[PDB]
């Protein structure tokens, strides 16, 4: 550990933007659409769409862990604490060569294969007061989730029920104990944000996460169900996360696509409610892959040599 006190701000961390831009370029030479459409305006309202048609090679895009080592004239500083807001003065900081192996998983609503919370479930937010700022949840115990191009994902109803609890409890432990915690599905928006979207085998899965976010701080949902089955769908025409615009990928082909990932975290986003009675409603969120990266770099910060 480094014997000094420094400031950290994962919400304004620059490595996030440095990885994000990398992960995008890690996408332009691995997953290339058959056609990519992107807004093109002079400002005069009228906006032509810039079209691009390239080969559409079916590649089973399988993410490789990524390290981030400071070159020279630069040093990475890691924060150490069982519960770090990731936005303030860190006491147990410590210089490191490369950040832990991170598997740049691009997804929405659920953070897959990320890094678990050592102690307990932690939830960071650039401002919990602002019903506009994504709440990044960090699970201390991942929940396996298996998706298949066959059309769905299975999740443990047990583990997910617990998780919502040990999350619902960490929420009120920030918005007011004497406050009811509820979970509802997406409010609306793009398919990629409304469902738990992500990529598996180069196939863009779109799983309906209603059964994962319709939890009332009162009842249950395990009648005749051992596992939660999200009705997933693979799309060819998708909205790009790298930049405003659609993109069409070629249909599936491999006799079988399969994924078994660790739900290591979520991206929630409680609704304003305009100071109404203690009844905070949290819904799935994300779509801004940087929050993802953040959830992984929340305790890092590269700095110039002295």
């Amino acid at each position, epitope marked *: 550990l480094e014997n000094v006190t420094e400031n950290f701000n994962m919400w304004k961390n620059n490595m996030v933007e440095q990885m994000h831009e990398d992960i995008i370029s890690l996408w332009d030479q691995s997953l290339k659409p058959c056609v990519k*459409l992107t807004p093109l305006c002079v400002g005069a309202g009228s906006c032509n769409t810039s079209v691009i048609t390239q080969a559409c090679p079916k590649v089973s895009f399988e993410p490789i862990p990524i390290h981030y080592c400071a070159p020279a004239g630069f040093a990475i500083l890691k924060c150490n604490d069982k519960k770090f807001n990731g936005t303030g003065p860190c006491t147990n900081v410590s210089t490191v060569q490369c950040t832990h192996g991170i598997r740049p998983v691009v997804s929405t609503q659920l953070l897959l294969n990320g890094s678990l919370a050592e102690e307990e479930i932690v939830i960071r937010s650039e401002n919990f007061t602002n019903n506009a700022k994504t709440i990044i949840v960090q699970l201390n115990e991942s929940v396996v989730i298996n998706c298949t191009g066959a059309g769905h994902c299975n999740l443990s109803k047990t583990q997910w029920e617990n998780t919502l609890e040990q999350i619902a409890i960490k929420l009120k432990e920030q918005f007011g104990n004497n406050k009811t915690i509820i979970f509802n599905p997406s409010s609306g928006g793009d398919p990629e944000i409304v469902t738990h979207s992500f990529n598996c085998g180069g196939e863009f899965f779109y799983c309906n996460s209603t059964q994962l976010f319709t939890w009332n701080d009162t009842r249950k949902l395990n009648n005749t169900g051992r596992n939660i089955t999200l009705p997933c769908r*693979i799309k060819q025409i998708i909205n790009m996360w790298q930049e405003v615009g659609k993109a069409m990928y070629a249909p599936p082909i491999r006799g079988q696509i399969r994924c078994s990932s660790n739900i290591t975290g979520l991206l929630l986003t409680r609704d304003g409610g305009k100071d109404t009675n203690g009844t905070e409603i949290f819904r799935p969120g994300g779509g801004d892959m940087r929050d993802n990266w953040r959830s992984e770099l929340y305790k890092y910060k590269v700095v110039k040599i002295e």
Partner: antibody, heavy 128, light 110 residues
Framework: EVQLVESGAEVKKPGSSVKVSCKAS????????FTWVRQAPGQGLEWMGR????????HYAPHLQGRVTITADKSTSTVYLELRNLRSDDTAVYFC?????????????????????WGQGTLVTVSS | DIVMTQSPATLSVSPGERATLSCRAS??????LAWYQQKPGQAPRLLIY???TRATGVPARFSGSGSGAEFTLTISSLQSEDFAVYYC???????????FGQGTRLEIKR
């Protein structure tokens, strides 16, 4: 199960431009990708291009790039094929052809090259 | 740039008999190959697609065979109505640059 209807046969003169219509009915328009296939008398099919309707993108035949365009009016449910700078050889029966693509209005898209549904065909005579 | 050549420019055969057509392709077109049938003065007719799969509502006598650059639309007991020119369509490259065969007339030999 769609039924494609085309505009009337037109007699255009050299160096001009012609626009053939193609009414698509009987199913979900945006779920189809339409292709124009021309055929000169005595000659055989020649791929003119295809419009991935829903996306409003269309790719064309090498020997036509520049002088041809394919557009679709989702409102009226029509597809159009425009050839400009008409030559005599362009004289042919221009066919309108389409294929189902899948729940394209839902992100699903097979992007099929073959053509399951064909038009009645529109003849265009480009001569002086 | 793909050339699709239908070797049998013309095939004279009699009803009930078995007629065979062969479409030759430049480079490999995998299985993105369809077959069409055209009666004089009619829009083509999608017979086979994906090389070996008949289009909805088509006589089982039409056999779609092949893969790569060698396809074959073989027909068992040819029928009176089976007289027409046959066309193979290549639609495997992308960007889209589909090409048609030059044809084959399935004329009745008498």
């Amino acid at each position: 199960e769609v039924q494609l209807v085309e505009s009337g046969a037109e007699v255009k003169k050299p160096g001009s431009s012609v626009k053939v219509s193609c009414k698509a009915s009987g199913d979900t328009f945006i779920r189809y990708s339409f292709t124009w296939v021309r055929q000169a008398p005595g000659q055989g099919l020649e791929w003119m291009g295809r419009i991935i309707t829903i996306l409003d993108v269309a790719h064309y035949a090498p020997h036509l790039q520049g002088r041809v365009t394919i557009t679709a009016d989702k409102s009226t449910s029509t597809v159009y094929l425009e050839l400009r700078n008409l030559r005599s050889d362009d004289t042919a029966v221009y066919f309108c052809a389409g294929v189902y693509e899948g729940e394209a209005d839902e992100g699903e898209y097979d992007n099929n090259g073959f053509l399951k549904h064909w038009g009645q065909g529109t003849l265009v005579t480009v001569s002086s | 740039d793909i050339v699709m050549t239908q070797s049998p420019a013309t095939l004279s055969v009699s009803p009930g008999e078995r007629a065979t057509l062969s479409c030759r392709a430049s480079e490999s077109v995998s299985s993105d190959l369809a077959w069409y049938q055209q009666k004089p003065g009619q829009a083509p007719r999608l017979l086979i697609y994906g090389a070996s799969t008949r289009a909805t509502g088509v006589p089982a006598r039409f056999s779609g065979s092949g893969s790569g650059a060698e396809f074959t639309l073989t027909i068992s007991s040819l029928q009176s109505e089976d007289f027409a020119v046959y066309y193979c369509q290549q639609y495997n490259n992308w960007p889209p640059r589909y090409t048609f065969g030059q044809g084959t007339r399935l004329e009745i030999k008498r």
